[PDB]
């Protein structure tokens, strides 16, 4: 229940995330836009910062989400270590120019950087993310605001992200008042309707992983793909909903939002300026195996985050593995890196010798994690790229057994027994086969926006704000079709929010 103890913990967990977001957005402008840090160097510095901040205030407390920096195709999972930088090169050495940013660590111009992170205190957690964008510099200008706005489909994506974010914020604010809503009381039906029509206006589809949901203590949705739950009220937009919208558990009907509750928003929009046609938007995993295929568009990598399934137990033969398991289970149920578990990781002072100390510890931790993973104690949080499939291949396909195809050597089970589209009787395995079975291997760029809110009378928005996620000014088109019900409602909502009360937590200096 929303006690003072609960909500001030939420606040002090949130604004740490806010100031760390400011730190990263600081550093990236320092590095690229200003007169050069790589992705994995940003990540552990951000986590060091967050823990150094956490120490001052406050027993279970730490990083829910390790800071993830997706670039231009990846829906989620990219957050590598310093161990893996040469490995990424000598794996992707023969591939082509795409994914050069994520491979090398140096970011390019026009590169759509989706940052995300989160922090938790006693199970009360706050996630946040922001799609920012790189654009080259002005040199003749004195102040050098960097030159050019964005124009294309990525601009579409950013616009849809921000607009969907503000609209759902306002909707969940009107959840307090059964009034101050255009009748054009609140339901996942309405939420999915307004966000889908925004996506359709901007020609940017919703990604399967996106959601809006309730939160409770220790139960946020940090994983959302591995661990299960019976009591989960919230909305998702996956391939089943895509096919249903083309036609015409997570129940959406018996769901009306109430006072005194904490919610997570997480929206992912994949742009369509090419593609030519109607088609599906699904996800494909990234493995470390160069040898499964010959094509150059594929990315080869190793995920850094893990999560451990405390239900299972197995004595290890290996001292290093058992010590690392001690270090793990003394942490919590949230995902983690190997760098988080170490002796010198927060970097009270920072030099090269401490990074070297961390690297040696990492060399031991990978050996421990080998045995901890060969037994099914810990699993990887997968790296997922958005990939497009036209309906032509799917409808012309041949699936000799539908609703019965497992994938049988997928290790997690829950991404195995999925059945994304029950109609047409195709499963994830045959969908992967069809996605690969075509020279229309079109991968989409994606934009991401994540916030945490709580309903008391005001909407207390524990993340976001204008300091945080002010958008990179851009130049998009398809800017919001008027002459419909829902668009009138959305504009009335945006005007009426200026009076509804939205409190917003500021970052820490």
């Amino acid at each position: 229940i929303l006690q003072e103890s609960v909500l001030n913990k939420y606040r002090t967990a949130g604004q740490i995330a806010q100031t760390a977001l400011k730190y990263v957005t600081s550093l990236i402008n320092d590095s690229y836009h200003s007169k050069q840090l790589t992705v994995p160097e940003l990540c552990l510095l951000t986590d060091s910062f967050i823990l150094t901040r956490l120490e001052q205030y406050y027993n279970e407390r730490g990083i829910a989400i390790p800071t993830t920096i997706d670039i231009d195709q990846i829906s989620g999972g990219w957050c590598p270590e310093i161990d893996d930088t040469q490995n990424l090169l000598n794996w992707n050495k023969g591939k082509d120019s795409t994914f050069a940013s994520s491979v090398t660590g140096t970011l390019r111009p026009g590169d759509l950087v989706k940052i995300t992170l989160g922090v938790h205190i006693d199970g009360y957690t706050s996630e946040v993310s922001h799609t920012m964008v790189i654009y080259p510099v002005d040199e003749t200008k004195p102040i050098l605001q960097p030159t050019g706005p964005l124009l294309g489909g990525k601009a579409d994506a950013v616009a849809a992200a921000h607009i969907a974010m503000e609209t759902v914020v306002a909707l969940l604010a009107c959840a307090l008042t059964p009034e101050k809503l255009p009748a054009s009381g609140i339901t996942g039906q309405l939420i999915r309707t307004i966000v889908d029509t925004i996506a359709r206006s901007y020609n940017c589809g919703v990604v399967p992983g996106s959601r809006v949901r309730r939160i409770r203590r220790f139960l946020a949705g940090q994983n959302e793909g591995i661990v299960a739950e019976r009591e989960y009220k919230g909305v998702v937009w996956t391939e089943s909903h895509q096919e249903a919208d083309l036609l015409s558990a997570i129940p959406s009907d018996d769901f009306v939002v109430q006072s005194g509750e904490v919610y997570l928003i997480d929206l992912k929009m994949a742009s369509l300026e090419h593609c030519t046609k109607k088609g599906l938007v699904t996800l494909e995993t990234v493995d470390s195996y160069t040898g499964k295929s010959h094509k150059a568009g594929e990315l080869i990598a190793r995920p850094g985050a893990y999560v451990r399934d405390f239900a299972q137990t197995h004595i290890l033969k290996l001292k290093t593995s058992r010590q690392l398991l001690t270090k793990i289970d003394k942490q919590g149920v949230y995902p983690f890196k190997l760098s988080h578990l170490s002796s010198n990781f927060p970097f009270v002072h920072e030099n090269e010798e401490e990074l070297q100390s961390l690297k040696k510890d990492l060399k031991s931790f990978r050996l421990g994690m080998s045995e901890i993973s060969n037994n099914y104690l810990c699993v990887e949080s997968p790296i997922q790229i958005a990939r497009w499939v036209p309906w032509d291949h799917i409808l012309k396909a041949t699936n000799p057994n539908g609703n019965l195809s497992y994938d049988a050597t997928s290790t997690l089970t829950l991404p195995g027994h999925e059945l994304p589209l029950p109609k047409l009787g195709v499963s994830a395995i045959k969908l992967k086969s069809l996605m690969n079975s075509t020279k229309e291997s079109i991968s989409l760029p994606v934009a991401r926006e994540c916030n945490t809110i709580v309903l008391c009378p005001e909407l207390l928005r524990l993340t976001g704000g204008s300091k945080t996620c002010q958008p990179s000014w851009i130049h998009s088109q398809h800017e919001l079709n008027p002459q419909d019900s829902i668009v009138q409602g959305i504009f009335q909502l945006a005007t009426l929010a200026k009076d509804l009360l939205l409190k917003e937590t500021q970052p820490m200096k």
Binding site: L246, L247, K277, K278, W391, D392, L395, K423, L424, G425
Partner: peptide, 16 residues
């Protein structure tokens, strides 16, 4: 023959 009908309707929607 439900797959027949749903594929017919889906062809109808994607062709236009």
């Amino acid at each position: 023959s439900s797959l027949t009908l749903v594929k017919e309707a889906l062809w109808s929607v994607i062709d236009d």
